[PDB]
């Protein structure tokens, strides 16, 4: 990735060198990747740190072993053995530090323990969590971010295509999640799946929350996939609903007026209208046509380095949408014990509109 | 069966004690469904955060939405709703008994957004973590969890074999990766796996910390695949190096050195001798060969819920090996620019002896 880091870093540190923050930790992770492009694959236990100070070159700790796949790094390095004890290795760091008692930023993702076990020797300062700070850098994309994710939606696209040429009829829903998760691996740049695939089939469907189960999939049913990528570790997630053999006329009439409520809510995106208009444009076609109490969730969720981030297209919320945003746009109809809907894109929000990145047929497919 | 007692969560209590703690507080992760059976995914919000003071009955706790099977939870359930703002709408249970008692065990896996919001906690409670006390129940696995190791070190035996006996050639190391996973999800549940395989070949095995790339495995390349499964939860761990075409008298010799120091350092393991004399069986024994400088890890780590955990077979570790403990024999030869060797087994110490739980060759393999 051609990103840079440095500026990420400096307008992060200049947005509480401009909120008066004097301190903020990050350990391996999305904020981590975020910030440096490294992503330290395995650690726990192991502790693996980057404090981030009032403002200027951060730190990076350890362990060794991680070494000859860190050749490069600027804030740089220190190195503990399978020998040595962290924790007291905030030695000198520690302090540093800063004056006790001032204000610090920490990962809420992070688990606190590699902070617990610190304790002597850190509750000596006023710690809030990192997340309403970062966010703000995060939920504005840049132009390569963008590539990121439009790269993303077409390794998806292309196994949506490959997918539905296969055979489903009398393969579990576990088997196919597990298969789509193949699927989007065997395809560069993937570095991985953004999240496990979700199969639900037949009655299943009409559970948002559904996770593939042993139910096979059978003639009749209508099956919701929904799964994503990530490239450059920025992600994708897309939603298609298929019928296996004909659909009745109930589905046929459920799935258009998903489809319309989607099309019009992504035709509505725009740099300048809240984030609550686009959830009721496409809230309201499902309820003209009677269905409002059968769209139970909001219309898409930010993506990133997350597959859940800013900005939340929901009925309660007037943030306003703005250039670089990246997001679903996914309505859906959901009939308890018969089938569910559901129709989901990812949206980038360039130069006043809202464009597509995912492009796969959005018509009703029979298999 | 059969998965618990618990009974004991009053060992935890029993051993919290009158260790002397206070009381603890159980977050989301390895530790509940260590103690309950249930495995909550997943949450950074909410604070979801178990209850359990020194004795007495259980009570379900924090959030929002949950839901069934919590309805199977023990003693009492307590859900909702929406949002009632559980920085403090978490007292009357719950606060209640630490108001304001002694000290206090937090469970490591809370996440520090949970802890600082709400904070307090901050005071009067002298805090310290969960680990220090619960890893001692969860190091001496009981027989059950035992037989749950087994299971999944037979999905990982038989993985190898399905492995070995395909066509590695012209694959890249991602490729490779990918069958391995897909595989081990399609030889039964697991369920999951314990992590991320790993394939490494010829120069690239040189590094552990080694990430699947495209690289092809071509003739001439050893070629490193570590990988494991979970069984009802439990995580299984396996590495082993084969090459494609005949090897070299290089390849041959160092593979024989980590063949015989492998083999050793599981002879070793006994009831009442301390891991770092395990790991340096191992390690002498590369010394002796002039390979010293070219192991650059740990012998072993422990298996559980987690895949590191205690024991850790380390050079560090006084910790007295017990009947009950599991955990891998992993040592390994690193060599820069040219190739590695790794070869790791699960041992279970049961009866007083250590017992492989992976059977797979252990002989170079010419593929
Ligand atoms: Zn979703
Ligand atoms: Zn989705
Ligand atoms: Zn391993
Ligand atoms: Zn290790």
């Given at each position: 990735g051609?990103?840079?880091?440095?500026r990420?870093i400096?307008k992060?540190?200049?947005?509480f060198?401009?909120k008066?923050?004097?301190?903020?930790?990050?350990?391996?992770?999305?904020?981590?990747?975020?910030?440096?492009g490294?992503?330290?694959?395995?650690?726990?236990?192991?502790?693996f740190?980057?404090?981030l100070?009032?403002?200027?070159?951060?730190?990076?700790?350890?362990?060794?072993?991680?070494?000859?796949?860190?050749?490069?790094?600027?804030?740089e390095?220190?190195?503990?053995?399978?020998?040595?004890?962290?924790?007291?290795?905030?030695?000198?760091?520690?302090?540093?530090?800063?004056?006790?008692?001032?204000?610090?930023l920490?990962?809420?993702?992070?688990?606190?323990?590699?902070?617990?076990?610190?304790?002597?020797i850190?509750?000596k300062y006023?710690?809030?969590?990192?997340?309403?700070?970062?966010?703000?850098?995060?939920?504005?994309?840049?132009?390569?971010?963008?590539?990121?994710?439009?790269?993303?939606?077409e390794?998806?696209?292309?196994?949506?295509?490959?997918?539905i040429?296969?055979?489903?009829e009398?393969?579990?829903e576990?088997?196919?999640?597990?298969?789509?998760?193949?699927?989007?691996?065997?395809?560069?740049?993937?570095?991985?799946?953004?999240?496990?695939?979700?199969?639900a089939?037949?009655?299943?469907?009409?559970?948002?929350?559904?996770?593939?189960?042993?139910?096979?999939?059978?003639?009749?049913?209508?099956?919701?996939?929904?799964?994503?990528?990530?490239?450059?570790?920025?992600?994708?997630?897309?939603?298609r609903t298929?019928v296996?053999?004909?659909?009745?006329?109930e589905?046929?009439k459920?799935?258009?007026?998903?489809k319309?409520a989607?099309?019009?809510?992504?035709?509505?995106?725009?740099?300048?209208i809240?984030?609550?208009?686009?959830?009721?444009?496409?809230?309201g076609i499902?309820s003209?046509?009677?269905?409002?109490?059968?769209?139970?969730?909001?219309?898409?969720?930010?993506?990133?380095?997350?597959?859940?981030?800013?900005?939340?297209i929901?009925?309660?919320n007037?943030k306003?949408?703005?250039?670089?945003?990246?997001?679903?746009?996914?309505?859906?109809?959901?009939?308890q014990?018969?089938?569910?809907?559901?129709?989901?894109?990812?949206?980038?929000?360039?130069?006043?509109?809202?464009?597509?990145?995912?492009?796969?047929?959005?018509?009703?497919?029979?298999?």
């Amino acid at each position: 990735g051609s990103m840079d880091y440095k500026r990420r870093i400096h307008k992060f540190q200049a947005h509480f060198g401009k909120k008066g923050f004097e301190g903020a930790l990050v350990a391996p992770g999305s904020n981590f990747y975020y910030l440096t492009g490294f992503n330290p694959l395995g650690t726990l236990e192991r502790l693996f740190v980057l404090i981030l100070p009032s403002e200027g070159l951060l730190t990076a700790i350890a362990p060794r072993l991680y070494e000859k796949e860190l050749e490069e790094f600027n804030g740089e390095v220190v190195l503990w053995s399978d020998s040595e004890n962290p924790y007291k290795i905030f030695a000198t760091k520690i302090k540093e530090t800063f004056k006790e008692g001032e204000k610090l930023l920490i990962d809420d993702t992070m688990p606190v323990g590699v902070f617990l076990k610190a304790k002597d020797i850190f509750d000596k300062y006023s710690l809030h969590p990192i997340s309403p700070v970062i966010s703000e850098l995060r939920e504005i994309k840049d132009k390569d971010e963008i590539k990121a994710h439009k790269k993303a939606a077409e390794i998806v696209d292309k196994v949506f295509y490959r997918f539905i040429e296969g055979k489903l009829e009398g393969k579990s829903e576990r088997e196919l999640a597990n298969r789509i998760e193949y699927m989007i691996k065997n395809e560069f740049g993937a570095d991985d799946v953004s999240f496990e695939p979700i199969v639900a089939s037949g009655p299943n469907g009409a559970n948002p929350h559904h996770r593939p189960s042993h139910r096979k999939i059978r003639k009749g049913d209508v099956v919701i996939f929904d799964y994503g990528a990530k490239y450059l570790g920025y992600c994708s997630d897309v939603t298609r609903t298929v019928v296996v053999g004909p659909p009745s006329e109930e589905v046929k009439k459920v799935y258009e007026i998903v489809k319309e409520a989607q099309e019009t809510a992504v035709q509505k995106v725009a740099e300048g209208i809240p984030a609550e208009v686009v959830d009721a444009t496409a809230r309201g076609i499902i309820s003209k046509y009677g269905y409002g109490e059968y769209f139970i969730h909001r219309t898409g969720h930010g993506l990133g380095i997350d597959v859940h981030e800013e900005p939340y297209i929901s009925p309660g919320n007037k943030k306003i949408l703005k250039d670089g945003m990246v997001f679903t746009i996914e309505p859906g109809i959901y009939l308890q014990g018969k089938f569910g809907v559901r129709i989901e894109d990812d949206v980038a929000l360039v130069d006043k509109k809202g464009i597509r990145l995912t492009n796969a047929d959005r018509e009703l497919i029979t298999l």
